[PDB]
Design a protein around this ligand. Structure first.
Ligand SMILES: C[C@H](O)CP(=O)(O)O
Ligand SMILES: C[C@H](O)CP(=O)(O)O
Ligand SMILES: C[C@H](O)CP(=O)(O)O
Ligand SMILES: C[C@H](O)CP(=O)(O)O
Ligand SMILES: [Fe+2]
Ligand SMILES: [Fe+2]
Ligand SMILES: [Fe+2]
Ligand SMILES: [Fe+2]
Lengths: 193, 193, 193, 193
């Protein structure tokens, strides 16, 4: 219930900064009746920009006025069966680099992005980097032998990791993988949290 | 930029969750082309409810997809002049209870809500109990004697604060004020944070 | 440098709450010279209880006065080779239940505890529970077929998960596993974050 | 309890990281028996440095192993009477610059540091610039006219605040005060949070 959430959250914030329907409606160029309406979940039709302005007026953020992602835990758990896991071909300049067998996700923890990654190429030098991403990542070499390279794309550090190897990659640090030269392909689990 | 922020964030999350315009538009029932537009700034007219399903599909929250409150500081600062304060006369049980002189606030501190409160009632017995509120609040008796009350509405704790008294009230703790009986009126600084 | 950290942090906090060496030394029953000394890293010999009292006086916590766990990232990464991963037999009432092949850890993120867990028993009913633990957990069925059971130890929910299954277990929720009846043994990856 | 807390936390972490007294005592070079004692409350005499290696072995921080600041509230509250404030006369360049009348503080809000500051100097030109400080600070001109300055020490921003002015200074922003030139003295409420 986006509207319901907004309705409860708007009300709170308004009172929080000591404003009555009238005070607020003014700053927004709206009628007190309207504001009062919104506090009823009748705001569902508001646009992103308006919500943007309402936040500004209330000196806070759209996030602060919208509700939590929600809960989807089955008494505290979510299960994803193997066959029903999303696949996503990944091409770096039309070069099939990875394949993403997306694992179980949850609104109770969106920062969590589990992945079984299929390393397609095995050309260490034809390895394409990523600028690094937000949140840390946990890696476990599933199959084959991954040839990891992190740091500066111009001259990065590196280590070929045998199956069984586990690695941590701090947030925002650039990295790239491929199999050991000539080995063909490899597999690893990638956990972004 | 309420959209611009949304644009780079939708992009961020889309990639984070290993998806493409093509795949995302699908779960939403939109044009693969349409998403692309959103990711380019054309999201401005998206309704609240509409934002709700999107953040859901990306198993995240609208907050996570909208930008932070802007930065409204003048080189990390902001002033408010005395004749510039918003005034809100409070009413509990149809009684000229308080008067809220709203002090400086910053988008960089949504939770900071500084107030000068003029306590108009001087009859403790007639005091009205808010239900408590979120966020801790620091108080300072500006003038007069503040007759305070906190805890349970029926059998509450009492405290007589002389001018200069300073107090802290934890978040969620219910409370009420008045000027000590007969003293007429009191004043105090109330900082919610 | 525990002492160095404390030395810098104590200094900050002291000034923060407006106290001079003398003011502080008093409340602690120490000499100003001593306090001044500590601010030099000469506090290394302080005991847990004393640090406990110093914190109290400064109205803060030992944590707030001690330094961050430190950094061990090799330019942003840590690698653990398969053979060098800690093993830990786990017996529930002398019943070899699990085996813990601990993966790469890091001071930059202690909440992260990666584990390859060897499910030894395969008696669903002889399954022993855990009261649930702090932080969420990500699970991936490595080998065999795990027989998961979560919730109330008296009557929990359950699902036998085929290899490839991935599950999320919210913090503090009780859980237990074993292989599918008769299958012998199973393996899964456990990520606590 | 500075130990009691440490005891249950060491226990917590030990288990969290999949270890036993036997294994932990090893990396520390202690008696498997010794750890057990720690886990039972006998940790009181552990030196700071000693705490440093322990938290290290458990790849975590001393903070994570020590308990939170206690709770010092009277049913979620605490008062401070005017003749009860700690007084600290400030000195910058050997000048009776400020005077700090320390208001109420709570262990439940380590960062809340409320102050009544008596500004003794009235020569802007003689003002001394702190280097900025952590945590945002809300100010209120109690009496007089506060001649303010913020930004760079050489070419700073100036602002003349009349009694009643309210201002916010972001964390890390350098600044200085005095009473407007010739006015003799000013007073203001400074709330660090
Ligand atoms: C394995 C890699 O970490 C996956 P990427 O972040 O490059 O998408
Ligand atoms: C003074 C009071 O603390 C302000 P209220 O909480 O009633 O809004
Ligand atoms: C697999 C389980 O999650 C490991 P436990 O938390 O019971 O130690
Ligand atoms: C008033 C000032 O803001 C207090 P200082 O930062 O100098 O400690
Ligand atoms: Fe990655
Ligand atoms: Fe209040
Ligand atoms: Fe677990
Ligand atoms: Fe300051």
């Amino acid at each position: 219930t986006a509207s319901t959430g907004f309705a409860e959250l708007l009300k709170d914030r308004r009172e929080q900064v000591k404003m009555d329907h009238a005070a607020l409606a003014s700053l927004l160029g709206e009628t007190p009746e309207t504001v009062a309406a919104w506090e009823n979940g009748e705001g569902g039709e508001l646009t992103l920009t308006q919500l943007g302005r309402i936040a500004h007026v209330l000196g806070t953020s759209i996030g602060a006025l919208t509700p939590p992602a929600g809960n989807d835990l089955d008494d505290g758990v979510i299960i994803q069966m193997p066959d029903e896991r999303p696949i996503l071909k990944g091409v770096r300049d039309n070069v099939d680099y990875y394949v993403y067998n997306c694992l179980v996700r949850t609104k109770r923890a969106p920062s969590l992005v589990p992945l079984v990654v299929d390393v397609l190429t095995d050309n260490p030098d034809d390895a394409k980097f990523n600028s690094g991403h937000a949140g840390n990542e946990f890696l476990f070499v599933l199959e084959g032998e991954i040839h990891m390279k992190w740091g500066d794309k111009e001259n990065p550090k590196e280590a070929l990791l045998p199956t069984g190897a586990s690695m941590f990659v701090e947030e925002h640090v650039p990295h790239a993988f491929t199999a050991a030269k000539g080995t063909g392909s490899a597999k690893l689990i990638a956990v972004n949290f």
